[PDB]
Design an enzyme around this catalytic site. Structure first.
Site, short mmCIF file in Angstrom:
data_model
loop_
_atom_site.label_atom_id
_atom_site.label_comp_id
_atom_site.label_asym_id
_atom_site.label_seq_id
_atom_site.Cartn_x
_atom_site.Cartn_y
_atom_site.Cartn_z
N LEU A 173 0.81 -1.21 0.00
CA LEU A 173 0.00 0.00 0.00
C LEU A 173 0.84 1.27 0.00
O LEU A 173 0.29 2.36 -0.15
CB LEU A 173 -0.96 0.02 1.20
CG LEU A 173 -0.45 0.35 2.61
CD1 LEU A 173 -1.61 0.83 3.45
CD2 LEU A 173 0.20 -0.86 3.28
N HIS A 174 2.16 1.14 0.18
CA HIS A 174 3.06 2.28 0.07
C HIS A 174 3.25 2.63 -1.41
O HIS A 174 2.93 1.85 -2.31
CB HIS A 174 4.38 1.95 0.76
CG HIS A 174 5.22 3.14 1.11
ND1 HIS A 174 6.55 3.04 1.45
CD2 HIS A 174 4.90 4.45 1.21
CE1 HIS A 174 7.03 4.24 1.73
NE2 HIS A 174 6.05 5.12 1.58
N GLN A 175 3.79 3.82 -1.66
CA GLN A 175 4.09 4.28 -3.02
C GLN A 175 5.52 3.97 -3.44
O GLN A 175 6.10 4.73 -4.23
CB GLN A 175 3.80 5.78 -3.15
CG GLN A 175 2.33 6.14 -3.17
CD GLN A 175 2.11 7.63 -3.32
OE1 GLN A 175 3.05 8.42 -3.28
NE2 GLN A 175 0.85 8.02 -3.52
#
Lengths: 187, 285
Positions: A28-30
């Site tokens: 879910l991180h970029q």
């Protein structure tokens, strides 16, 4: 840095331990587009191979800049004034030569095998008795199942251990999500 | 005088199947024509989601569809009468309005999102009578029971559960999950669930996020809300809670309060009434 916390073993009615507890760890991180921050650490303290299981509880040490500089926008807050922080933890002065990795496993896909071998814009007159593939037969997959879209149970991975240092990640050098080595000890 | 043998209640707070359409942002209020997920390849033009379902808030709480004993019938109706003379449905209704306030009916299409906005419309005809806008990431999802202008949405559902008006709610949820990733609808017996060639969520799964109310249970209040279930269990995480050995449980709290007229400071009766709003074939023997 030092500012790492563990919670105690409480049952959580929001996270099923069925098919996604060893898949979605930093998804879910970029970090896959890499437009802002790029520092993230991936670890696995738990190597227990008894029967059909490898890794089931969360202890994964990330970087120092990600909690402090990247969180200028509300993305992990809201849970500020829930409890009072107690006696602080220390960074462990021992560490072993243990740590696991997963970096480079992409060499020869198995859903698409017969046509990767020889296409260089030419014909095939001898393509039946080129090499014997019927000699080798192996069946073992004890690795972390990490899934994606249009997957079955798990595609593949083999243990390609041996690259290990006591050195963590560096800036600008990322391959998938982690560099050569790292710091996490047993206790 | 005793429990009947055949008793069933009907599903109040019935949602419809929530059809999920994608579409590009900056066309938000002019979203008459956003296409739906056409199956199984998803673009990158569309950067947000659109989840719409209608919700009927019916009315009647302790009136069974099919009872079996008339003395038990009137005793249960007077128990619901002594509950409703004490207070309205507004304490349950504000907690239903809390689940309406965010998009927690987006189960995993909400975790991993940068801005989610929920628009609830109370409609009398095709004309919209009063509208709402909430920000799902910025409102609660756990506790502390505090946000302004949500009390009107609570009083609406309290009127509709108490029967003071027909209530029809037409909700829309815009999830900025990112610039066209592949979202996940429900799944039948592996094939994704559809309606007409448009992907959607089941109404029991949309409805399961609505009776996710119950922050009151035997353990300490640190983990938050569970869905209001008889023998209140969790089906995939594994922990099957509310054991009938200890007494805090639906069939125990129903049969000792109807038949044995219990009233200490036990005003967490909201679990029992929230089970009656859920309905179902309760027992019996």
């Amino acid at each position: 840095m030092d500012h790492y916390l563990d919670i105690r073993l409480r049952p959580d009615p929001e996270f099923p331990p069925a098919q996604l507890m060893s898949v979605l760890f930093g998804k879910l991180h970029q970090a896959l587009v890499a437009q802002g921050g790029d520092r993230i650490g991936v670890s696995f303290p738990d190597l227990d191979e008894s029967r059909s299981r490898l890794g089931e509880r969360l202890r994964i040490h990330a970087s120092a800049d990600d909690l402090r500089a990247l969180l200028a926008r509300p993305w992990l807050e809201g849970l500020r004034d829930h409890l009072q922080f107690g006696e602080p933890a220390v960074v462990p002065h021992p560490t072993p030569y243990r740590q696991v990795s997963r970096v480079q496993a992409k060499s020869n896909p198995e859903r698409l095998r017969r046509r990767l071998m020889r296409r260089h814009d030419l014909s095939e007159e001898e393509a039946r008795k080129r090499i014997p593939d019927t000699v080798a037969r192996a069946l073992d997959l004890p690795f972390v199942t990490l899934r994606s879209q249009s997957t079955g149970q798990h595609f593949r991975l083999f243990i390609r251990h041996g690259p290990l240092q006591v050195t963590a990640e560096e800036g600008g050098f990322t391959c998938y999500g982690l560099s050569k080595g790292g710091f996490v000890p047993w206790f | 005088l005793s429990t009947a043998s055949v008793l069933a209640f009907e599903r109040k707070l019935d949602p419809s199947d929530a059809l999920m359409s994608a579409g590009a942002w900056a066309q938000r209020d002019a979203s008459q024509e956003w296409p739906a997920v056409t199956v199984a390849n998803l673009p990158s033009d569309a950067d947000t989601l659109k989840v719409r379902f209608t919700l009927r808030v019916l009315g009647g709480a302790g009136t069974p569809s099919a009872c079996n004993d008339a003395a038990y019938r009137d005793k249960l109706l007077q128990t619901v009468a002594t509950y409703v003379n004490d207070q309205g449905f507004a304490e349950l209704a504000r907690r239903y309005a809390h689940n309406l306030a965010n998009a927690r009916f987006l189960w995993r299409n909400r975790v991993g999102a940068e801005a989610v906005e929920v628009r609830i419309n109370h409609i009398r005809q095709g004309e919209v009578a009063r509208a709402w806008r909430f920000d799902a990431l910025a409102i609660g999802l756990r506790d502390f029971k505090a946000d302004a202008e949500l009390d009107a949405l609570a009083e609406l559902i309290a009127s509709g559960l108490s029967g003071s008006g027909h209530v029809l709610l037409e909700v829309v949820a815009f999830a900025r999950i990112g610039d066209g990733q592949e979202v996940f609808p429900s799944q039948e017996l592996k094939t994704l669930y559809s309606v007409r060639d448009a992907a959607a969520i089941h109404s029991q799964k949309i409805g399961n996020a609505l009776r996710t109310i119950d922050t009151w249970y035997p353990d300490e209040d640190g983990l938050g809300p569970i869905a209001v279930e008889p023998y209140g269990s969790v089906t995939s995480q594994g922990k099957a809670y509310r054991q009938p050995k200890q007494k805090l449980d639906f069939y125990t709290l129903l049969d000792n309060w109807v038949l044995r007229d219990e009233a200490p400071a036990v005003e967490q009766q909201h679990y029992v009434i929230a089970n009656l709003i859920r309905g179902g074939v309760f027992g019996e023997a």
